[PDB]
Amino acid sequence: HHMKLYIMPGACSLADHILLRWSGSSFDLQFLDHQSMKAPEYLALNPSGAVPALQVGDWVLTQNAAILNYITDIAPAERGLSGDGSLKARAEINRWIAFSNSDVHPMYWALFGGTAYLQDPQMIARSQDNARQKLRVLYQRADAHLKHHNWLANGQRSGADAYLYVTLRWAKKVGVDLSSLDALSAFFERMEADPGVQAALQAEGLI
Amino acid sequence: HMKLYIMPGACSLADHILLRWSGSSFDLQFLDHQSMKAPEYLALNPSGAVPALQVGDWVLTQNAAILNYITDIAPAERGLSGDGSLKARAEINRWIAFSNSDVHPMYWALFGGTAYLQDPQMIARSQDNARQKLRVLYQRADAHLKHHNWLANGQRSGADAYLYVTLRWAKKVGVDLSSLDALSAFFERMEADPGVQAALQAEGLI
Numbered sequence: 129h130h131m132k133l134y135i136m137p138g139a140c141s142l143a144d145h146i147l148l149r150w151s152g153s154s155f156d157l158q159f160l161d162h163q164s165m166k167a168p169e170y171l172a173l174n175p176s177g178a179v180p181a182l183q184v185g186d187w188v189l190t191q192n193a194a195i196l197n198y199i200t201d202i203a204p205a206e207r208g209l210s211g212d213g214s215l216k217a218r219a220e221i222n223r224w225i226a227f228s229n230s231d232v233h234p235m236y237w238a239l240f241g242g243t244a245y246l247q248d249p250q251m252i253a254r255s256q257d258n259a260r261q262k263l264r265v266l267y268q269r270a271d272a273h274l275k276h277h278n279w280l281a282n283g284q285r286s287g288a289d290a291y292l293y294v295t296l297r298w299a300k301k302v303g304v305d306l307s308s309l310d311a312l313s314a315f316f317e318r319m320e321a322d323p324g325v326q327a328a329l330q331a332e333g334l335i
Numbered sequence: 336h337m338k339l340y341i342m343p344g345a346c347s348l349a350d351h352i353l354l355r356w357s358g359s360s361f362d363l364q365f366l367d368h369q370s371m372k373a374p375e376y377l378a379l380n381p382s383g384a385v386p387a388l389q390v391g392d393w394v395l396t397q398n399a400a401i402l403n404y405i406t407d408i409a410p411a412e413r414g415l416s417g418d419g420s421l422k423a424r425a426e427i428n429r430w431i432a433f434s435n436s437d438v439h440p441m442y443w444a445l446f447g448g449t450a451y452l453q454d455p456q457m458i459a460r461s462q463d464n465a466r467q468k469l470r471v472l473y474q475r476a477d478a479h480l481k482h483h484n485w486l487a488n489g490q491r492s493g494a495d496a497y498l499y500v501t502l503r504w505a506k507k508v509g510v511d512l513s514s515l516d517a518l519s520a521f522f523e524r525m526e527a528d529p530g531v532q533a534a535l536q537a538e539g540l541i
């Protein structure tokens with residue numbers, strides 16, 4: 129109740145939801161729609177009208193990268209979400225959060241109606257194929273990294289893994305080819321076997 | 336002991352500006368669209384993109400990660416972490432993420448990212464769309480800057496360096512920044528900054 133996470137089921141807010149559960153923090157979910165996000169109540173809270181938003185008392189934090197880092201910062205060290213807690217450890221988490229946040233996530237724009245302005249069905253389809261080809265390349269990079277690493281950063285689970293997992297769920301909704309990416313596949317299954325991930329998916333109605 | 340891999344005027348200029356503000360000792364390593372795809376740099380960064388910050392044998396690559404690392408190593412007296420609280424770091428992070436994940440990728444069609452469309456009219460529509468979406472994002476920044484001189488905690492941070500760098504691209508690609516007086520004043524404050532000027536000059540920019 130002191131902390132409220134504004135979510136849309138299956139959206140990027142799911143990464144923050146997963147991390148909150150891994151941190152062991154007490155929090156309250158506030159459910160939003162593509163309609164309720166654009167309503168004046170949430171626009172007063174976040175003018176951008178986009179999820180996630182994390183309310184800590186009267187303070188409203190908005191970027192996934194900022195929220196994930198904030199949850200990491202407040203989590204007790206025993207939860208192991210900051211690695212050894214050094215500058216290098218935080219930098220490793222940050223680089224992999226930025227990979228999902230600024231390389232992976234925006235490549236999904238064409239796959240979530242971002243290219244509707246093209247009007248031409250063939251052009252819209254080409255933009256989607258391009259997004260899938262570029263995403264395939266990015267996921268091959270993540271898979272190559274996961275072949276020799278347990279987790280993305282510092283060999284320990286972090287907000288970086290929660291974010292990568294959420295993008296993989298989108299890949300599995302928009303037709304991104306993840307075949308022959310065995311390390312990435314094992315990572316996805318490890319995540320889905322996790323009680324914190326399962327609790328989050330269930331609470332959001334993705335079961 | 337630190338080496339920053341740059342391309343003149345690229346997103347790496349934000350890290351360059353912050354390194355000057357931090358007072359840190361650093362070397363610049365200049366790259367091309369060709370030298371970045373060369374095997375020597377691909378061994379350091381397989382993504383074949385700038386920035387990259389080398390600290391000894393360690394190579395750090397994401398802009399957001401580099402900006403936060405520079406902030407973390409800067410002496411407290413430099414005032415790049417605000418009051419230094421979790422809320423202060425979160426305010427810096429939200430504004431870094433705004434330029435990193437909202438502004439920066441909207442420039443993709445404006446920098447040849449929609450060439451696959453082939454048809455010139457469709458490529459032009461993708462550029463017009465990128466410009467329209469960017470004016471909306473810059474209106475948001477302008478609305479925030481109407482009541483704040485700096486993006487986070489009323490004190491200069493890596494967030495300010497990043498927003499300024501994209502505003503340089505806006506001017507080069509035809510993004511409409513008219514009637515955005517607070518963002519215009521921000522751009523002017525930045526260009527008058529000695530650390531910014533020192534960075535622009537070292538990069539051979541104007």
Ligand SMILES: N[C@@H](CCC(=O)N[C@@H](CS)C(=O)NCC(=O)O)C(=O)O
Nearest residue numbers: 139140162178179180191192436437
């Ligand atoms: N850079 C922002 C992006 C925010 C964003 O893309 N939010 C999406 C959720 S994935 C959203 O609200 N989409 C639907 C809408 O705006 O109606 C962040 O990572 O928090």
Ligand SMILES: N[C@@H](CCC(=O)N[C@@H](CS)C(=O)NCC(=O)O)C(=O)O
Nearest residue numbers: 230231345346368384385386397398
């Ligand atoms: N998410 C990455 C994006 C990296 C990136 O976009 N780098 C650009 C510089 S603006 C680049 O190297 N562009 C041209 C190229 O790859 O040839 C970050 O912020 O560091």
Ligand SMILES: [Cl-]
Nearest residue numbers: 223224227396
């Ligand atoms: Cl990376």
Ligand SMILES: [Cl-]
Nearest residue numbers: 190429430433
């Ligand atoms: Cl923001």
